């Protein structure tokens, strides 16, 4: 395109529980980093490298319009799998998505946005090196990138699903009796066949 090939190649992010991807810089805006220098500091650790700086130019232009964290959060919330009825609820939904659904291994606490920005910037930084050819692409066949799910972890995968059903079942059983006005028997609320 006329302007499509002028900006170059832009980076997007496919966050969980969002129907459509979002520009990468928007995610940084939502995390609380507004100025371009603050965002680029988490992506490019050596500003003396002109090659890296150019790769992020199209991404910055794509998210130029969004200039505030709340604006960015609304954009993320607007594309959520369950769009909010009002703008305020959209921001809350987007905050929850980034708080827990995005990079959960980095953290789930309310004050882990800075840690998630660094790792997200590292993900972008790793992508740029692959695009720039500085680092070789990862090999799926390489067996150190693999993990083996043995009996334990496989069983632990089942137990949480089956334990969630157990906890859901007691909630349903108790709710019927509590609404009826009578206390409930814990022994009777538990369905032992769920786990067995």
């Amino acid at each position: 395109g006329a302007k499509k090939s002028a900006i170059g190649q832009r980076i997007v992010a496919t966050l969980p529980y969002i129907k459509q991807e979002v520009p990468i810089i928007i995610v940084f805006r939502a995390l609380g980093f507004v100025s371009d220098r603050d965002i680029l500091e988490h992506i490019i650790y050596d500003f003396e490298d002109p090659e890296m700086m150019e790769m992020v130019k199209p991404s910055l232009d794509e998210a130029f319009v969004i200039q505030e964290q709340n604006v960015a959060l609304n954009f993320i919330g607007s594309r959520g799998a369950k769009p909010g009825v009002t703008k305020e609820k959209r921001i809350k939904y987007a905050k929850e998505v980034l708080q827990k659904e995005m990079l959960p291994h980095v953290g789930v606490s309310d004050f882990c946005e800075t840690k998630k920005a660094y790792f997200l910037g590292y993900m972008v930084h790793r992508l740029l090196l692959a695009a720039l050819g500085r680092r070789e692409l990862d090999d799926r066949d390489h067996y150190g990138n693999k993990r083996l799910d043995l009996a334990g972890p496989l069983l632990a995968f089942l137990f949480r699903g089956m334990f969630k059903n157990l906890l859901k079942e007691v909630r349903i059983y108790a709710q019927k009796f509590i609404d009826r006005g009578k206390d409930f028997n814990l022994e009777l609320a538990i369905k032992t066949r769920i786990i067995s």
Binding site: Y45, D46, H105, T114, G144, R147, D149, L150, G152
Partner: protein
């Protein structure tokens, strides 16, 4: 135990550093989480290796990987990693006597 030891040693937390310091230092990853940066990667690996071989803080199945070119130290403690026992060689000699 790995994170507690790393904090005790000269590893700076990500929150408590300026981004300008990340260029020279090596990123420290524990189970894929960028814990911090360290200014002396070679000494840290020697210390990390020593602890594992003495089984002091680092268990035998903990794998520490240093990517010298990429300035990254990756420590993995999760399950599912396939490993095998290998004899340690120092100064072109077997430690097995």
């Amino acid at each position: 135990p790995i994170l507690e030891f790393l904090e005790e040693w000269s590893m700076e937390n990500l929150e408590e550093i300026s981004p300008a310091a990340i260029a020279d230092a090596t990123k420290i990853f524990v189970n894929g989480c960028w814990v911090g940066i360290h200014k002396d990667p070679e000494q840290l690996m020697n210390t990390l290796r020593k602890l594992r071989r003495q089984m002091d803080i680092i268990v035998s199945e903990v794998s520490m990987i240093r990517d010298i070119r990429e300035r990254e130290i990756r420590i993995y403690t999760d399950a599912g990693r396939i490993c095998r026992p290998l004899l340690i060689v120092e100064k072109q000699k077997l430690l097995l006597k």
